[PDB]
Amino acid sequence: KTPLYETLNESSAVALAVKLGLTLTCQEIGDGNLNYVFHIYDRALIIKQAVPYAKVESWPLTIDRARIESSALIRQGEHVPHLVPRVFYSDTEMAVTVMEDLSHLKIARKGLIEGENYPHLSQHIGEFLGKTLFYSSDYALEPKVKKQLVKQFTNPELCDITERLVFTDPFFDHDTNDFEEELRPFVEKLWNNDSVKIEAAKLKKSFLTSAETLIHGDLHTGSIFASEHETKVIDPEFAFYGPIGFDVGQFIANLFLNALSRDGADREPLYEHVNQVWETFEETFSEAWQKDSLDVYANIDGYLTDTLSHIFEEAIGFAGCELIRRTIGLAHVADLDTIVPFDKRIGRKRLALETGTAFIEKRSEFKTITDVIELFKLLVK
Amino acid sequence: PLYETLNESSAVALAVKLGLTCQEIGDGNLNYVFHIYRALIIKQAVPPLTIDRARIESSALIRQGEHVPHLVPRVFYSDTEMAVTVMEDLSHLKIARKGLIEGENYPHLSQHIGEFLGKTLFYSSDYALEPKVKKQLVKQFTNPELCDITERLVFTDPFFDHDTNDFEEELRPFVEKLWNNDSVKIEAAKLKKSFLTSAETLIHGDLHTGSIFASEHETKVIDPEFAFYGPIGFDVGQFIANLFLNALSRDGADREPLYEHVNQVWETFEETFSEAWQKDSLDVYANIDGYLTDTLSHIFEEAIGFAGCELIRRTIGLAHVADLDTIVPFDKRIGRKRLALETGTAFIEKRSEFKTITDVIELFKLLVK
Ligand SMILES: Nc1ncnc2c1ncn2[C@@H]1O[C@H](COP(=O)(O)OP(=O)(O)CP(=O)(O)O)[C@@H](O)[C@H]1O
Ligand SMILES: Nc1ncnc2c1ncn2[C@@H]1O[C@H](COP(=O)(O)OP(=O)(O)CP(=O)(O)O)[C@@H](O)[C@H]1O
Ligand SMILES: [Mg+2]
Ligand SMILES: [Mg+2]
């Protein structure tokens, strides 16, 4: 058999949607250069397709990621179908996912920067977190089943992006970092900080080795669609078997990153979201543990409590890496880069480094999410 | 289907067909071990458990042979479909558990196994390997059925009133004390969760004294059928526990060689792992002062915790050790088995308190006086 992959265009995408049985118009609406996102109208549909390195950032990547993203979306839909787009069709060789159109929603990072507060965002994401992370763990699944899922969701290339960018590069004078010269005194203070780098190393080691559950792997505010009443998580291409606290930490850090871009009393909705997302995660995870654990140890008093404390500790450490990583690393966030005037931008970026560092160092000292919030507020006054 | 169960005649046929008298000498019912005489061993899995364990065993032995060829039997041929490994004959050696029970002291056993542990455990980790490579090895060495036996027998069944357990009734009061101990069971749960999730290196997975050939001058580790990507501390802990199990079967001053072994195996492990880390780590963090030290402390902590589960598991679970079961008279056996439970319990609960291997040894000695 011949190679089946062919790069879609707007006409090809309409032809595909028809051949698959789902007068039409199509527009390519993709935000980056690694994927095409084809919007098809009249009822609407999205066809997403991975772009191979030769035709593309980038970042040399195979189109295998499309298989991960599709399979991860489908898995999430079995547990939280109201919190992810529906998937109608997918194909590994064509590297295509056909999914629900969510054009009536706005990317959460964009809305947050515009000053939208999204009152239910943390309640929805906390539920997403609690259910996705529990139901794919050894707590919820027979170990033989979970062990096959580890193989199926092994994601070497995309893991390599996170291992480098989240956990390694910002902490050294590496080629991928990207920061203003005004920041250099403070960046160098990080590079020279042995005790924080040792802690980042341990966190990386956990990312590399702790195959606890199927994670989303890139759950930032730009990876969520939002309106006042709805929330949908997208693009689980980084999915693999990793630490439970990782997704929780990345999301929380992106909430703090937005808080930093804001001023004064405007920060309060974000601090409320940090509190609510932890609380809802913990409640959701705990309810799932109680009802659906297969573990004979699950209902011994203190075991769930200690499990949550460890997830919490790692989540805050991971949050700290993300705070740092987004500030001086290859991949930045609009929350910080669009701060004006310039000297304010530098000052707030200095604070993301300082808060990130404190999170990493003090992760095992915090007892509750409010301790984390209260420490943050003091540091950013 | 290409699989056919060998007999003594077809074993020699295979050895000749591969261009390399016969007696089946296997000490269990799941594998045939054919000795052919220059000499050769042909091990074959029999078809409850998949014959895929033979592919794991061969692959694991070969990988071990890349780093410690002097400490594992050489492999000449292997075949997944036939479930065979053709390997070096080690008939001139004795199973270390048997020798230890007979009173052999094996002066180099500790230095040899410590070297085996340091090198096998380092060189298959993320410390030594590109993460993309390690991740392929994780897939290759996934071992669901064998891992299942360990998850059940080492980490679960002894801590509850489960059907697989096997203990003398005189031991019941002390068994029920363990079952009723919430805080120890929570800690066993955490160690099981680490076994289930922490894919740190390719481990042997069943490194007890019955899995080692020994003489005065030579040591060879065998049967890595349980191999998979698991916690670095696991093999270290199981081995140490089996040294302590032999100490419990001995009396007084005759225990000293075993305590010496426990000390030397940790020391040699730590030294070997540290030397490899220093020379062969790919990690940009490797050389920050404190990171290796903290890495070792965590390995140590887990090892002690896993030693505790192995002490308990061997005493009251499905799979016993001859060290304990052959103690006479009865009443002494029961006493020594109560101590294996109490020491294993202390190891699990106190694992993060110990600062050095000496602390572990001294605590054990105190308890078993
Ligand atoms: N289901 C959907 N409904 C409506 N618009 C969608 C959509 N999926 C994607 N889009 C549009 O396409 C953009 C790109 O989506 P997505 O984040 O999946 O692409 P990407 O994977 O190429 C980005 P990255 O490289 O940062 O991960 C979105 O921000 C959105 O505007
Ligand atoms: N390389 C070798 N050289 C000489 N004898 C060997 C040998 N490998 C195995 N044997 C002999 O056969 C016995 C069974 O070997 P082994 O322990 O590998 O098998 P097994 O896997 O069937 C046991 P278990 O069921 O407990 O795991 C050994 O105790 C030893 O006496
Ligand atoms: Mg993407
Ligand atoms: Mg065996």
Cis peptide bond N-terminal to A58, omega within 30: yes
Q: Is A34 in the pocket of ligand 1 (CB under 6 A)?
A: yes
C-alpha A134 – ligand 1 centre gap (Å): 26
Cis peptide bond N-terminal to B257, omega within 30: no
- Token pair for B211: 């899995």
Which residue in the block uniquely carries the two structure tokens 């897939």? Answer: B139
Which residue in the block uniquely carries the two structure tokens 């016969």? Answer: B22
- Token pair for A260: 């930093």
Q: Order of strands, edge to edge, in the sheet holding B75-79?
A: B22-24, B31-36, B40-45, B84-87, B75-79
B31 labeled part of a ligand binding site:
yes
Q: Hey, whose CA ends up nearest to atom 23 of ligand 1?
A: A32
Spatial contact of A19 and A37, defined as CB atoms under 8 Å apart: no
* Cross-chain Cβ contact A204/B151 below 8 Å: no
Spatial contact of A291 and A223, defined as CB atoms under 8 Å apart: no
List CB contacts of B226: < 8 A, sequence separation 6 or more: B56, B143, B146, B147, B149, B150, B203, B204, B205, B206
Experimental technique of record: X-ray
Distance CA B101, CA B115 (A): 24
The residue in chain A having the minimum alpha-carbon distance to the alpha carbon of residue B155 is: A297
Closest-CA distance of chain B to residue A209, Å: 5
C-alpha B54 – ligand 4 centre gap (Å): 9
DSSP string, B238-256: HHHHHHHHHHHHS-GGGGH
Q: Hey, whose CA ends up nearest to atom 5 of ligand 1?
A: A103
Enumerate the known binding-site residues of A for substrate. 218, 325
Closest-CA distance of chain B to residue A237, Å: 17
Question: Ligand 1, closest atom to CA A103?
Answer: 4
Q: Residue B189, SS3?
A: helix
Q: Is A85 in the pocket of ligand 1 (CB under 6 A)?
A: yes
C-alpha B222 – ligand 2 centre gap (Å): 8
Q: Which ligand approaches the C-alpha of residue B75 most closely?
A: 2
Pocket, ligand 2, Cβ cutoff 6 A: B 25-28, 30-31, 33, 41, 73, 87-91, 95, 222-223
* Cross-chain Cβ contact B284/A172 below 8 Å: yes
SS3 content of chain A, % helix, strand, coil (to 5): 55, 10, 35
Which residue in the block uniquely carries the two structure tokens 């309810």? Answer: A287
Spatial contact of B76 and B37, defined as CB atoms under 8 Å apart: no
Provide φ and ψ at A61, rounded to 5°.
-140, 140
- Token pair for A67: 């298989």
Test mutation, B197, B281, B293, B352, chain A, max A CBs within 10 A: B197
Resolution reading in Å: 2.0
Q: Which ligand approaches the C-alpha of residue A98 most closely?
A: 1
- Token pair for B369: 């006086």
Distance CA B349, CA B186 (A): 9
C-alpha A31 – ligand 1 centre gap (Å): 6
- Token pair for A269: 């909705």
Q: Residues of chain B whose C-beta is under 8 A from some C-beta in A? A: 126, 131-132, 134-136, 138-139, 142, 144-145, 147-148, 151, 156, 160, 182-183, 185-186, 188-190, 192-193, 196-200, 283-285, 288-291, 294-295
Type and span of the H or E element at B306: helix B291-316
Distance CA A213, CA A118 (A): 28
User: Residue A7: how many CA atoms within 13 Å on its side-chain side?
Assistant: 10
Domains of chain A (ranges, CATH numbers): 1-104 (3.30.200.20), 105-381 (3.90.1200.10)
Test mutation, B285, B295, B348, chain A, max A CBs within 10 A: B285
CA A87 to centroid of chain Cα atoms: 19
The residue in chain B having the minimum alpha-carbon distance to the alpha carbon of residue A304 is: B186
Provide φ and ψ at A99, rounded to 5°.
-140, 170
Distance CA B166, CA B178 (A): 15
Task: From chain A, pick out residues whose CB is under 8 angstroms from the CB of B284.
Answer: 168, 172
CA angle A182, A184, A188 (to 5 degrees): 160
- Token pair for A288: 């799932």
Task: From chain A, pick out residues whose CB is under 8 angstroms from the CB of B160.
Answer: 296
Which residue in the block uniquely carries the two structure tokens 């095409």? Answer: A36
Cis peptide bond N-terminal to B329, omega within 30: yes
Q: Which amino acid is at B32?
A: Y
Closest-CA distance of chain A to residue B247, Å: 31
Q: Residue A35, SS3?
A: strand
Question: Ligand 2, closest atom to CA B89?
Answer: 3
* Cross-chain Cβ contact A306/B190 below 8 Å: yes
- Token pair for B355: 């600062």
CA dihedral A70, A73, A77, A80 (to 10 degrees): 180
